[PDB]
Recover the amino acids of this structure.
RNA sequence: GUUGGAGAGUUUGAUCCUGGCUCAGGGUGAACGCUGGCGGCGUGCCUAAGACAUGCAAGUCGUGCGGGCCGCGGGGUUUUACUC
């Protein structure tokens, strides 16, 4: 039981003696809009055999999300490849402003409001796990003063 | 109320990066085409600081002052001219 959007598909080429041969690849999201969200990337001989497979990888590739009033806890930036991904919390009423692919992934993960830009290289797939990582790395006003300080926690609080 | 930030297309049998050209967004003192019922409020030589006919666009005070003129009313003479 997981709602699951789909990001992008492509046909890629191998080669051989006498004509080409192929394979297709399917970028897939997942996510209970309250918290969680996965991604997959699936290759297979005939198309929706892949689109189906890509759904698989996403179930294991899950990322719980710190979510806070439908928005992002602090600001944030991450590189991965030469594709540079930006997030930043928006207020109630500003909502999934983000190009093509963060929208797909942020929405389904459950964001109401957010701000966003994409950078340099724009290839989907990088900006895909650009942001899978951007989100693996969100940190919370409590996860946090119990990363630091928490040396001696429960004397503080 | 940190009030605020969407990208894609295209080099290759295909893939990753660089990189240019390109399109989507809003903007006008606008013009051009097909079309054109109205009203309010704006607004209208961006080009030749090229050349301009005709009319108007800076005058007002008779309580600063002396007369022209064209009359009008009243006076010195019995009537004229002329004069106040
Ligand atoms: Mg780099
Ligand atoms: Mg680039
Ligand atoms: Mg080609
Ligand atoms: Mg804009
Ligand atoms: Mg226009
Ligand atoms: Mg006409
Ligand atoms: Mg002029």
């Amino acid at each position: 039981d997981f709602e699951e959007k789909m990001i992008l598909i492509r046909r890629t080429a191998r080669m051989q003696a006498g004509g080409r041969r192929f394979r297709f690849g399917a970028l897939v999201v997942v996510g209970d809009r309250q918290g969680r969200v996965g991604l997959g990337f699936g290759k297979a001989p005939e198309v929706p055999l892949a689109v189906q497979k890509a759904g698989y990888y996403a179930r294991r590739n899950m990322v719980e999300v710190p979510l806070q009033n439908g928005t992002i806890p602090h600001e944030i930036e991450v590189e991965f490849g030469a594709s540079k991904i930006v997030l930043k919390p928006a207020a109630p009423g500003t909502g999934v402003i983000a190009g093509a692919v963060p929208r797909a992934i942020l929405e389904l993960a459950g964001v109401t409001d957010i701000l966003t830009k994409e950078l340099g290289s724009r290839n989907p797939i990088n900006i895909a796990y650009a942001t899978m990582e951007a989100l693996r790395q969100l940190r919370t006003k409590a996860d946090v003063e119990r990363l630091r300080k928490g040396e001696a926690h429960a004397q503080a609080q």
